[PDB]
Design a protein around this ligand. Structure first.
Ligand SMILES: O=C(O)CNC(=O)C(=O)O
Ligand SMILES: [Mg+2]
Ligand code: NI
Ligand SMILES: [Zn+2]
Length: 331
């Protein structure tokens, strides 16, 4: 079995290997990459996403979110407070202000120490889930707006034609902006491209060990667990690497820099934080190997998780027994 320790693998495709997206994912999996839950892909030196990022300041962040924490430094939740709209240029100035800017630090490990020590004492502001793309239409390789759709994959594998669409989303981050422990909707893959700015540090649990993370989370967040048998779908809970190690949970970490792609694999729990002002693009995708994970994905039916239109068909076709309860949680 390839990659039995579930290490995060880093790939350097050539320009020729960068042509066929599906084929390269299947290649990475042939080398065991999915066992980690996360892989990094460094694009060939000849590739670019677009010509420049000099003209993005007028994009609107309609509903910036202030991420307010509660708990202790290593075990906390966050809630999202809505703020007034602002442009990307206004958000960048805010990220760089004395109140929000990255502190002085020696290296990525020092900054990670500072994040876990001090995150809860601040409330950074995040632009999230903004439908759109920064890939040039003429970028033919790994263009996250031109991927094969999840609805087409389900039709190809299973024969069922369904409604729904699959488009990318932009993220604008600052120092201490935080992504809580989660798997993707319907335990899909994700791909994330860091277009510009400062890094993102990721934490990930191997898919084969995801239930260990879920059991710790029920212990650490006991009222949330009584409220919902899939409360990690709410995307609010954080657990530090130190707490994970104290509890024996297998995990890995890596820092993504501008110009790099990350792929998350089905049922790979992940979390992380941004180092400073940045912009990322991400989208969910599927392969044939996903189908069996989609059929088994947990679901939130308490009402908290609320998701896109296109998830309806995935539940309806893959999880007909669960569909009526889940749809009630959507309404
Ligand atoms: O960049 C982000 O904020 C979040 N992205 C992810 O959790 C992802 O691609 O799975
Ligand atoms: Mg603009
Ligand atoms: Ni994710
Ligand atoms: Zn729920």
């Amino acid at each position: 079995a390839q990659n039995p320790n579930c290490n995060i693998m880093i790939f350097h495709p050539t320009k020729e290997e960068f042509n066929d997206f599906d084929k390269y994912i299947a290649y990475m999996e042939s080398q065991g990459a999915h066992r980690a839950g996360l892989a990094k892909i460094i694009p060939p030196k000849e590739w670019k996403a677009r010509e420049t990022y000099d003209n993005i300041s007028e994009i609107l962040i309609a509903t910036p979110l202030q991420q307010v924490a509660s708990g202790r430094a290593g075990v906390f939740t966050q809630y999202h407070k809505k703020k007034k709209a602002m442009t990307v240029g206004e958000y960048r100035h805010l990220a760089n202000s004395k109140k929000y800017q990255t502190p002085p630090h020696q290296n990525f490990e020092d900054l990670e120490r500072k994040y876990w020590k001090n995150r809860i004492y601040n409330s950074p502001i995040y632009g999230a889930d903004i439908s759109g793309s920064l890939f040039d239409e003429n970028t033919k390789q790994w263009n996250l707006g031109h991927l094969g759709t999840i609805q087409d994959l389900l039709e190809k594998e299973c024969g069922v034609v369904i409604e729904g669409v699959n488009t990318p989303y932009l993220y604008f981050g600052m120092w201490k902006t935080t992504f809580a422990w989660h798997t993707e909707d319907m335990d899909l893959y994700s791909i994330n491209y860091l277009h510009l700015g400062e890094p993102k540090t990721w934490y990930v649990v191997p898919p084969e060990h995801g239930q260990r993370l879920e059991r710790l989370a029920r212990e650490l967040f006991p009222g949330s667990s009584r409220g919902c048998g899939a409360f990690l779908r709410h995307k609010v809970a954080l657990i530090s690497p130190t707490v994970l190690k104290e509890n024996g949970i297998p995990f890995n970490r890596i820092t993504q820099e501008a110009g790099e792609f990350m792929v998350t694999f089905p049922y790979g729990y992940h979390a992380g934080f941004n180092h400073g002002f940045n912009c990322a693009e991400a989208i969910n995708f599927a392969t044939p190997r996903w189908i069996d994970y989609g059929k088994m994905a947990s679901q939130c039916s308490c009402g908290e998780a609320r998701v896109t239109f296109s998830m309806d068909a995935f539940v309806r076709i893959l999880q007909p027994e669960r569909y009526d309860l889940w749809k009630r949680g959507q309404d």
